């Protein structure tokens, strides 16, 4: 998602680097994770074209 | 072959009319020989959903 | 076969039917809160003390209800729920963080055939089950968390019901009295009130055998300790009076119906009306005074009904649920009245309301006080459904 | 949310959620219904909200006066019971059409039994 | 493109709106007259304060318009039967259906018969009577379905009550059709003694 | 005038049978507001739209083609096997499910202008992330379906054990118990194999007689002290647990 | 050898054909049933003499848009009756059985299609299916419940299409365009134990899941036999014959010749390669060939629609004295080939939804 609720960062733990996920925000029960993959745009609709949320106004 | 022999099958059975469903499709078997042609009409198979596909992993 | 695959089909219609309700659902009914539950609750009702948070619509409300199960094990289990007060306050009317929780769980015996509280002490219930003993609890005593040691504690149950039943009715004035039904064909009294400590199973205080057929509901008078009456699959209500000698014989009797006859509802407001439903898609009413004539009659329902009772604040109003997955309202004061083609098209004048807002079958619906227009229901796909109807209809 | 909008406040495009209905119980309730008009004539002859009735005489009945009158009997079976009428009710009354609201509760399932069916369909429990 | 197959597509969603609305008119989800935007129906104001003590007087009188009693002790005559051997007449009683059976029972008893002769059409015969008592009961006809009859030589049948409470036939003359496994029928005339 | 689309490659229209009346649900409207109201509810498996006549008045429609029409009851219902899916002859386990629909009715004013869900829980079924395969609600909480080693692992890394050729039997089964017990609790730091050969020790002391590596293993132990990752005493006590 | 076309048969969908199969699970005197499954439709028919082929129950996947591709017939021992069970691109299991007039067994949890359908030979309620998603997992139908998945991380990182029992169903050999020659012992203690227990397994007893095993180790492997697609293997006894994409029939056998089978070690790498029956102008994969229920009389087809026709008697490719059929209305595309249960009769399908019968002038 362009905006997840959940984040990616690369860890450094032990001399071996690993990734971390944690949440951007406050989750409750059975919300679905998204993370933001961090390709270009292009890239972006040629992968992940969908995101599934327009603006309220 | 031995239990071949012992386990009794059940032959075969022909199709029977439907008058529920007579609007069924009909498929007439072309026969390419000098047999006649032979027509049987068709039943809808069991509806099932989907799983979008993924490759086997551990 | 035909019948399998015609209820296949009717899977399909059932499906679109509720499609069709919960769509047009908002623009017709001014409440919409649904609840579904892990296990089915024969029955619920709820708590007559509620409490309104100063400055948030939500109210605290609290539900008292019992579980059924395959195999497994059931609890005496009591839910709070969070409704708005107000409507001018827009999750989509308050804090996302939900307004529905649970909070009690009791071990309990089989599945809870009826259950109430005393009203004289709404924190002692009487559980009737499968088993011929009516468990009593007392939540504020028990602990609230379950206990997995599987062992129940229903302290001060009743006995004197050979076998289980359907029937619960508390007294009104008498403190501690409850009148209780089963397939006996008897019908049990306890006096709480009077319970030493015995032995923690309590003997029926008085026994009555007055229907030839299995009694399934009693009641008594909602005013008055000394009058109650029974009602029983033999298609006749019978009427009851305290001290009236022989418990074999009635002060009154009449036949209610063409076919069984399973739910029985005084008026709280006015003394003389009675009014009963019945197993063939009828609901009925009498008088104290008039038992050889019915008053009226409802038709609107389509299959078996086994609940009724009578609306709080409105005594002009009158409800019931049945097995047709249909809940309609009938407004007393429009009985007979004149009405446009389109009203007679619809139903008739004295109909108030139709509910049927849910898949599976709704075997219980209850309101609360200082609620009059908001109902809870019980449908078997463990669905709790809370609901309050536009003003418009009623001005 | 006070701000909050209409419920079509969920995406733009989604894939398809797959559909509870079934093709070939289509069929069979077409059927169902292909012969159901076939008797009732809902519709062609009720144009979808009506239902002709062709009416016939069972029995004739003479009074000591000049009343005569027939106990009407209409085609469909599945009618409302049978009534007595006057001669110079016949030709008159011989094409009923009846509304679906003025329809008798217990023709409701002797119609279609899928108008309503009854879940349990036997006392398995209450 | 061909609209056979623009229709094709859309038959499926107009053949189920047209099976819901058959379902719908006759077992509806919800109330037409409390749609907000069709306000017209139901548009007359609830006034609670309507006292409903007066519904037992109101409805008193209603059976005192409405009080219904019976003649007493069928009794009937036999004239003669038509057609291009005797005859046998049976009686039924309706039952409704209870909570446990799938349909409602039906129970058969024999009333009687009659040697009818072949066809007869006139000057047969030299006049003969079939006596029924008060089989029919108010009291059972409240717990049962109204009572019907049967007739045998070839089928027929004929009902005697209505749910209305009020009884269908009466003192006049009845010509009864024939079926078989216009037509075969038997005449006869009613009366009460 | 009532028009039928089908990405306009083929198109239909029909006329008023009369004028405020509904095609399908034979309902007398009366209103304009009504009519369109009626059809955008009672009929939410098409779609309504307003395209104006020369006399006002006309209706295009089509197809719902992201129509909601699908199973609302309990998820699990479905993917059951026929004569079991839609039993209703006794109770289902499935998660609390709550929903709210309804803040408040906005009872706006009718007009012609006004035309062109607060979920909580659980929704949908939950399938076993180890097989694909549908995960009852009975089981919301052991369903982990991974620990601190997964299986097939210890069978992958035994055989890469015996790939080894310069390492005898005897010294080669010692690298596999040792690695196999790791991995079973995932020790991170110092302190832990300290304490972590004590308890293997004790683990499999007896094994250790069995397969008659108690000398080999003590060749590892000294190994351990050459990495400078266990103490002296440490060693001491491993031989009183060994005999 | 002595092989002539007596009937010809086309079906009037015109769609290309799939997999066929005879009622080897018969009993004597019992009706001559072969099935056959085209892209959505599946049929039976029954040969006869003269060589009349009456046509048999037909039934249409009106739902699912997709072609199915695998079929093979099933045994219920409860019931005595036949059945049989079919998948395709949609990769779900449909199991007809024809004394019903439908299917109430559904197998879903397959990824990708599924391209191959073949029961144990011993138990008729084992089923291992192979699909695109690299799976061998197998379903317990009398039970419901799924069994141990072979393959998985160390199996194919290409798709499986191939996979037979052996005789006694003691070991599986499977293949896919990996080109990887992997087999998984039956035999193994392990799983007969969960076999033992998914008999009788029950979630009404209790809440714990069933736990299918999966595994991911060969009893032997290899790639060396083929540089192009092979498309089809089955179990020579001892032996394992292949087919490819490079018009070569090769048989072989794994190690030397006297390494066994049941005695060699999942380590073990080497090959001896055996079979030398050559064809040609057949390069296109997704063919698939058949064998007689004595394991006696091979018969293959072609793309060009030519027929392949081979004996398992003291013929041997030492020298391969080929017998190739050939009809001249038969030549658009040979989809599948299956022997009945005997010498006498075959039948043949060509991909123009085109039936062409082939009976022994025995």
């Not at chain 1, 001399?15 to 925000?25: E, L």
């Not at chain 2, 239990?3 to 009319?17: G, N």
């Not at chain 3, 059932?14 to 001014?30: A, G």
């Not at chain 7, 009756?81 to 079919?86: E, G, I, S, Y």
Request: aromatic share 10%; with cysteine.
């Amino acid at each position: 998602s362009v905006n997840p609720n959940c984040y990616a960062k690369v860890m450094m733990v032990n001399g071996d680097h690993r990734i971390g996920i944690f949440a951007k925000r406050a989750i409750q029960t059975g919300e679905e994770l998204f993370f933001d993959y961090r390709y270009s745009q292009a890239d972006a609709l040629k992968y992940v074209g969908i995101e599934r949320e327009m603006e309220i106004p | 072959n031995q239990e071949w022999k012992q386990r009794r099958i059940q032959p075969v059975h022909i199709l029977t009319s439907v008058s529920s469903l007579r609007g069924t499709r009909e498929c007439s078997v072309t026969s390419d020989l000098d047999f006649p042609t032979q027509v049987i009409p068709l039943k809808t198979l069991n509806a099932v959903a989907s799983v979008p596909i993924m490759y086997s992993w551990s | 076969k035909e019948a399998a695959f015609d209820d296949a089909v009717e899977e399909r219609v059932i499906n679109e039917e509720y499609k069709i309700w919960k769509k047009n659902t908002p623009f017709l009914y001014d409440l919409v809160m649904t609840h579904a539950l892990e296990w089915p609750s024969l029955t619920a009702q709820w708590l007559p003390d509620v409490t309104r948070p100063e400055g948030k619509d939500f109210s605290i409300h609290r539900l008292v209800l019992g579980t059924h199960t395959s195999d497994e094990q059931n609890h005496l289990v009591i839910a709070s729920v969070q409704l708005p007060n107000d409507d001018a306050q827009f999750g989509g009317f308050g804090s996302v963080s939900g307004k529905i929780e649970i909070e009690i769980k009791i071990n309990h015996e089989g599945e809870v055939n009826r259950a109430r509280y005393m009203p004289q002490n709404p924190c002692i219930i009487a559980t009737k089950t499968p088993s011929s003993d009516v468990l009593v609890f007392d939540y504020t005593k028990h602990p609230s968390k379950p206990d997995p040691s599987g062992e129940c504690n229903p302290d001060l149950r009743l006995r004197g019901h050979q076998k289980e039943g359907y029937g619960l009715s508390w007294n009104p004035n008498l403190s501690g009295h409850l009148l209780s039904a089963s397939d006996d064909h008897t019908i049990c009294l306890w006096d709480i009130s009077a319970v030493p400590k015995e032995g923690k199973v309590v003997d029926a205080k008085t026994i009555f055998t007055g229907h030839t057929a299995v009694v399934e509901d009693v009641s008594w008078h909602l005013l008055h300790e000394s009058l109650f009456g029974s009602v029983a699959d033999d298609q006749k209500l019978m009427i009851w009076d305290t001290r009236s000698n022989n418990t074999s014989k009635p002060s009154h009797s009449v036949d209610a119906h063409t076919a069984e006859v399973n739910c029985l509802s005084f008026n709280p407001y006015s003394e003389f009306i009675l009014a009963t439903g019945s197993a063939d898609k009828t609901v009925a009413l009498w008088d104290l005074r008039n038992l050889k004539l019915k008053l009226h009659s409802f038709e609107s329902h389509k299959d078996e009904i086994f609940q009724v009772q009578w609306s709080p604040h409105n005594e002009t109003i009158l409800a019931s649920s049945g097995t047709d997955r249909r809940l309609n309202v009938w407004d007393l004061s429009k009985i007979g009245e004149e009405q446009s083609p389109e009203d007679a098209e619809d139903g008739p004048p004295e109909l108030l309301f139709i509910h049927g807002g849910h898949t599976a079958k709704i075997s219980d619906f209850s309101w609360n006080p200082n609620e009059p227009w908001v109902i809870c229901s019980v449908s078997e796909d463990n669905i709790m459904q809370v609901w309050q109807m536009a003003e418009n209809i009623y001005n | 949310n006070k701000r909050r909008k209409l419920k079509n406040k969920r995406r733009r495009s989604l894939p398809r959620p797959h559909d509870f209905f079934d093709a070939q119980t289509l069929d069979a309730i077409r059927h169902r219904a292909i012969c159901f008009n076939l008797s009732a004539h809902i519709e062609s002859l009720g144009k979808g909200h009506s239902v002709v009735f062709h009416s016939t005489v069972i029995a004739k009945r003479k009074e000591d006066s000049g009343k005569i009158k027939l106990l009407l009997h209409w085609m469909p079976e599945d009618i409302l019971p049978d009534v007595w009428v006057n001669e110079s009710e016949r030709h008159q009354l011989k094409t009923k059409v009846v509304h679906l609201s003025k329809l008798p509760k217990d023709t409701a399932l002797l119609l279609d039994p899928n108008i309503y069916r009854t879940m349990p369909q036997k006392r398995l429990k209450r | 493109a061909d609209h056979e197959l623009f229709l094709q597509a859309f038959e499926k969603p107009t053949q189920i709106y047209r099976f819901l609305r058959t379902r719908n008119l006759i077992a509806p989800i919800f109330l037409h007259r409390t749609l907000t935007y069709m306000s017209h129906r139901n548009s007359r104001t609830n006034i609670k304060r309507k006292t409903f003590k007066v519904d037992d007087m109101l409805s008193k009188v209603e059976k005192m318009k409405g009080e219904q009693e019976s003649h007493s002790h069928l009794q009937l005559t036999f004239t003669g039967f038509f057609h291009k051997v005797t005859l046998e007449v049976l009686l039924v009683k309706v039952c409704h259906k209870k909570r446990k059976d799938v349909s409602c029972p039906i129970r058969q008893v024999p009333t009687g018969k009659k040697q009818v002769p072949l066809n007869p059409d006139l000057n047969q015969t030299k006049p003969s009577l079939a006596v029924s008592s008060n089989e029919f009961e108010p009291s059972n006809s409240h717990m049962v379905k109204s009572y019907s009859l049967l007739f045998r030589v070839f089928v027929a049948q004929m009902t005697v009550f209505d749910k209305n409470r009020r009884l269908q036939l009466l003192d006049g003359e009845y010509e009864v059709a024939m079926q078989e496994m216009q037509g075969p029928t038997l005449q006869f005339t009613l009366r009460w003694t | 005038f009532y028009q039928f689309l089908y990405n306009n490659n083929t198109r239909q229209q029909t006329e008023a049978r009369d004028d405020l009346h509904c095609p399908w649900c034979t309902l007398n409207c009366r209103k304009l507001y009504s009519l369109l109201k009626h059809l955008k509810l009672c009929h939410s498996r098409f779609i309504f739209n307003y395209v104006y006549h020369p006399k006002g008045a006309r209706i295009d429609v089509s197809i719902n083609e992201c129509y909601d029409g699908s199973y609302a009851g309990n998820p699990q219902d479905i993917h059951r096997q026929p004569g079991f899916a839609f039993s209703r002859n006794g109770p289902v386990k499935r998660t609390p499910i709550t929903h709210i629909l309804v803040c408040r009715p906005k009872r706006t004013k009718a007009s012609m202008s006004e035309f062109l869900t607060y979920s909580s829980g659980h929704n949908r079924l939950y399938f076993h992330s180890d097989t694909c395969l549908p995960l009852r609600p009975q089981e919301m909480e052991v369903d982990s379906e991974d620990e601190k080693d997964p299986e097939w692992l210890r069978e992958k890394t035994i055989t890469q054990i015996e790939e080894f050729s310069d390492v005898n039997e005897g010294e080669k089964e010692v690298m596999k118990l040792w690695n196999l017990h790791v991995m079973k609790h995932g020790f991170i730091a110092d302190n832990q194999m300290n304490h972590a050969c004590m308890l293997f020790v004790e683990n499999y002391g007896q094994k250790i007689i069995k397969k008659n590596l108690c000398r080999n293993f003590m060749l590892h132990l000294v190994s351990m002290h050459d990495f400078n990752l266990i103490s002296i005493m440490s060693i001491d006590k491993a031989v009183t647990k060994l005999r | 050898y002595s092989f002539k076309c007596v009937n010809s048969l086309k079906e009037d969908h015109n769609q290309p054909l799939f997999g066929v199969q005879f009622n080897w699970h018969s009993k004597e005197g019992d009706p001559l049933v072969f099935a056959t499954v085209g892209s959505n439709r599946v049929t039976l028919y029954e040969c006869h003499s003269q060589g009349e082929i009456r046509l048999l129950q037909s039934y249409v996947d009106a739902d699912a848009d997709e072609n199915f591709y695998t079929c093979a017939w099933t045994y219920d021992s409860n019931t005595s009756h036949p059945l049989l069970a079919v998948a395709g691109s949609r990769g779900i299991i449909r199991i007809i059985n024809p004394i019903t007039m439908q299917c109430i067994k559904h197998y879903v949890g397959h990824g990708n299609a599924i391209n191959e359908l073949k029961f144990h030979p011993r138990d008729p309620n084992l089923l291992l299916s192979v699909s695109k998603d690299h799976a061998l997992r197998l379903w317990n139908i009398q039970t419901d419940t799924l069994v141990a998945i072979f393959g998985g991380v160390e199996g194919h990182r290409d798709e499986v299409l191939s996979a037979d029992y052996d005789l006694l169903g003691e070991k599986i050999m499977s293949c896919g365009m990996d080109h990887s020659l992997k087999l998984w012992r039956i035999n193994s203690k392990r799983m007969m134990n969960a076999i033992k227990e998914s008999y009788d397994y029950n979630p009404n007893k209790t809440n714990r899941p069933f736990i299918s095993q999966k595994i991911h180790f060969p009893d032997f492997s290899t790639r060396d036999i083929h540089r192009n697609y092979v498309d089809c293997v089955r179990w020579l006894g001892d032996l394992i014959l292949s087919k490819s994409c490079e018009n070569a029939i090769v048989c072989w056998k794994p190690g030397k010749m006297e390494d066994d089978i049941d005695k060699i070690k999942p380590s073990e790498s080497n090959v001896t390669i055996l079979g030398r029956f050559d064809y040609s102008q057949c390069d296109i994969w997704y063919m698939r060939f058949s064998m007689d229920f004595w394991q006696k009389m091979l018969a293959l087809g072609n793309q060009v629609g030519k027929l392949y026709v081979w004996d398992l008697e003291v013929e041997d490719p030492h020298k391969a004295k080929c017998t190739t059929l050939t009809h001249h209305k038969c030549g658009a595309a040979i989809r599948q080939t299956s022997f009945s249960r005997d010498s006498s009769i075959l039948i043949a399908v060509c991909d123009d939804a085109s039936i062409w019968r082939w009976d022994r002038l025995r």
